[PDB]
Paper text:
We co-expressed 14-3-3β with either ExoSE379A,E381A or ExoTwt ART domains in Escherichia coli (for details, see the Supplementary Methods section). A protein complex with an apparent molecular weight of roughly 83.5 kDa (indicative of a heterotrimer: an ExoSE379A,E381A monomer bound to a 14-3-3β dimer; expected molecular weight 83246 Da) readily crystallized under various conditions. Numbers in italics indicate the ExoS residues that were resolved in the electron density. f Detail of the electron density around carba-NAD in the active site of ExoS (2Fobs –  Fcalc electron density map contoured at 1σ (0.1073 eÅ−3)). g Comparison of the ExoS apo and carba-NAD structures. The loop containing F354 is in two different conformations, where the open conformation from the apo structure is marked with an asterisk. In all our protein complex structures, the phosphoprotein-binding site of the exotoxin bound 14-3-3β protomer was occupied by an amphipathic peptide containing the LDLA-box in a short α-helical segment (ExoS residues 420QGLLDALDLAS430) in which the D427 side chain hydrogen bonded with the 14-3-3β Y127 and Y130 side chains, and the hydrophobic side chains formed hydrophobic interactions within the amphipathic groove of 14-3-3β. In one of our crystal structures of the 14-3-3β:ExoS heterotrimer, the residues connecting LDLA-box-1 and -2, E433-D442, could not be modeled; but we found unambiguous electron density placing LDLA-box 2 in the phosphoprotein-binding site of the second 14-3-3β protomer. LDLA-box 2 bound in a configuration that was highly similar to the configuration of LDLA-box 1 in all four structures. Thus our structures show that the LDLA-box in the context of the ART domain binds to 14-3-3 as the LDLA-box containing peptides, and in binding, does not distort the 14-3-3 structure: The ART domain and its C-terminal extension appear to wrap onto the solid scaffold of the 14-3-3 dimer.
Two of these, exotoxins-S and -T (ExoS; ExoT), are homologous enzymes consisting of an N-terminal GTPase-activating protein (GAP) domain (73% identity; 81% similarity) and a C-terminal ADP-ribosyltransferase (ART) domain (78% identity; 87% similarity). The ADP-ribosyltransferase activity of ExoS and ExoT and their cellular toxicity are dependent upon association of the ART domains with 14-3-3 proteins. Here we present crystal structures of human 14-3-3β in complex with the ART domain of both ExoS and ExoT. Collectively, our results indicate that 14-3-3 proteins act as exotoxin chaperones rather than activators.
Author numbering:
A (entry chain A): 2 to 233
B (entry chain B): 3 to 206, 212 to 232
C (entry chain C): 232 to 432, 443 to 453
The structure:
Amino acid sequence: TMDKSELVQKAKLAEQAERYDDMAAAMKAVTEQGHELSNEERNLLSVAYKNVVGARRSSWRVISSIEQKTERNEKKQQMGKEYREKIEAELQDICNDVLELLDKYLIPNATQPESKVFYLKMKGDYFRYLSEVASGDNKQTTVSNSQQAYQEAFEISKKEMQPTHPIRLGLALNFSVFYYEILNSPEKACSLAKTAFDEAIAELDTLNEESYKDSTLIMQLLRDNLTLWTSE
Amino acid sequence: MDKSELVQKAKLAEQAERYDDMAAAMKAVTEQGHELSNEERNLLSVAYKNVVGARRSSWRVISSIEQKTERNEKKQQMGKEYREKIEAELQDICNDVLELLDKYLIPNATQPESKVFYLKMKGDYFRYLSEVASGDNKQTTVSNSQQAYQEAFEISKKEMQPTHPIRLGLALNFSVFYYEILNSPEKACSLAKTAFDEAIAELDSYKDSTLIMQLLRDNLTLWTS
Amino acid sequence: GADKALADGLVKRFGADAEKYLGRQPGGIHSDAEVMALGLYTGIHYADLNRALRQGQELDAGQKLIDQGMSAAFEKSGQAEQVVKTFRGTRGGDAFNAVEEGKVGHDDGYLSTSLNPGVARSFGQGTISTVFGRSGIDVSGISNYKNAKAILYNKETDMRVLLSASDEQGVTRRVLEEAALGELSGHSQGLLDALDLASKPVRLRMRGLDLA
C-alpha cells in the first residue's frame, strides 16, 4: 500500500509530533521491504526504537524503585509486580522486533563496515536491554548475546574504522557501560574506555570535517566515565 | 479488578508516565457508577489531560508543518492524512471523557464544588473538539462548550467563594475559550477582569488561588497590550 | 592607492625580502601588499611579530606594515565554502591553555596551522591541536618551507576548545574550532541521537484542574 518515500515522510512527521510508536512502525515497514537503508533511514529507525524502548526502560526503573519502597501488603506487592511484568512484556516485544529486523534484514544487507558495526552495536544494545529485566537462564543467554554482538562490532571497528569514528566511539561507550552495569566489571569497563580514548587522542588528525563534534562529545563521555570509575 | 486495585494501578501508571494506562484504570473506576473522591477525580483529570494533551500538541506541530510545506502534493497528502489520524484520536479521547461526564460524573455530583469542576471539564473537552472541528460540527461543539462553561459559572458565582481555585480555574479556561475559540478579546478580558477583581476584593493562607489569579492577571496585561 | 602605498612601504622597508613574494599567487584574490606581507610572515617574521603581539609590545615600522598587510588580506578573504582541518604543534603551551573545554578564547598573535599532519605531531612537541575553520588564508603558494601547506588564522581569532586532553606521554591533545562556525557545526545530522548513547542527558497546584 505505502511506498518507501511515503513511509519515510510519515516517520519524519511522527518524529516532530513526538509520536514514536508511529515513527517505529513506519521505519519497521521500510526495513521489511528488504533493501539496505540509507544513513538517514537508519538514523530514523534507530531514533524511533530508542524512544519506544527508552520509555519502557524508564517506566521499568520507576516501578522497580516503587516496588522496593512500598509497604508490607500482599495485595500492593502483587499489583506492583504485575504492573512491572506488564512493562517487561512490552519491553521484550520491542527488543524482539528490533532484534528480528537486525537478524533478518539490517545486519545481512549491511555492505559497508560502518553500517555493519552500527547494527551489531545496536544488537548488543537491545540484548543489553533484555538483560536488565531478565533473570536466571534467560539472563545468561541475553547477557552472552549482548557481549557477542558488541565484540563482533568491536572487531570490525578496529580493522575498518578510524579510532575517532563516532560509530566506533559510541560502540566503545555502550560496550564499556555493558561491562560496568551488566557484568559488574569496573576493570573491563575502564580497560575498554581507556584504550578507545587513548587510541582516539593519538589520532585526532583522523577527525572527519563532517562529524568532528560528534567525536569530541563521545570522547568526553568516555573520559568522564574513566575519571568517575577510577575515583579515589 | 476492584476500585482499590484500579486506583493503585492508576497511581503506579502516573509515576511511570503511562497515561493511557492511568486513563483506562480511572475510566473503569468511573464506570462502577459511584461518585468519585477528590483524589480519584484528580487522578481521572490528570490522566486524560495528558492523554488529550499529547494529541493537541502533535496536531499543532503537524498543522504548523502543513502550512510551511506547500511544495509537493504527495507530501501535502501525507501531512493531511497524518493530521486527520491525530484528529480522529483526539475526537475519540474527548468523546470518552464527555461520555463519562454525561453518564456518571455530572449526574452523580452532589456538592456544587464537584458540579462546577465537571461542567468546567465538559467545557474544556468540547473546547478541544472545537479546535480541530470545521463547519456544522464546529458550531455544535463551540455551543456545547459555551453552554457547559456558562452552566458551571452560574453555580460557581452562587455557591463558591471568588477565591476558590475551582471557580478561578473556570474563569481562566472560559476566558481562554472566548479569546481562542470565539476570537472575542473583549469577552475574554471582561470575564478575566471581573474574576480577578472579585478575588482581590475578598482575599481574607493559599498560594493555590494566588497562582491562578496570577495567570488571569498575566492574560489581562498580555491581551490589553 | 592604499594597497600601492602599503606595497611601497613594504618594498622600501624590506627590499628584496618583500619583493621575492611578488606574483606568487596568480589567482590574484590578494593585492601585492597582502601577498608580500603574508610571505614575509610565513617565511620568517612570524616569530618576531607574534612575540610582540602576544607580549603586548609596540610594533616597529616593519612589524606594523606586515600586520596591516595581513589584516587587509583577512578582510578581503572572508569564510571559505567548506570547513578545513589543519594541525598545529608547539614545544610548550599556547593561548588556549587557560581556556576551559566548551568555552572560547583566542591567541593575540596570528595562528599558523598546517594541512600537513607530519610537520606538526608529535616528537618534542608539548601541545598538539586539530583545528576546524573557514576564515583561514592558504599561503602554500606564497611560502612553503618543508611543504607545510600553511593555513593562517587572523590574530585574536576566537576559538572554542572542543576537547582538551592529555596523552599517557604527557602531550596535550586539543581540538579547536573557529567560534564563528556555529554550535551545530561538526555534527552529522541525527547520528548522536541514533547512536543511542548509554549516558544520562498549571505547575503543581492541580493537576486535577487542567489550567489553560
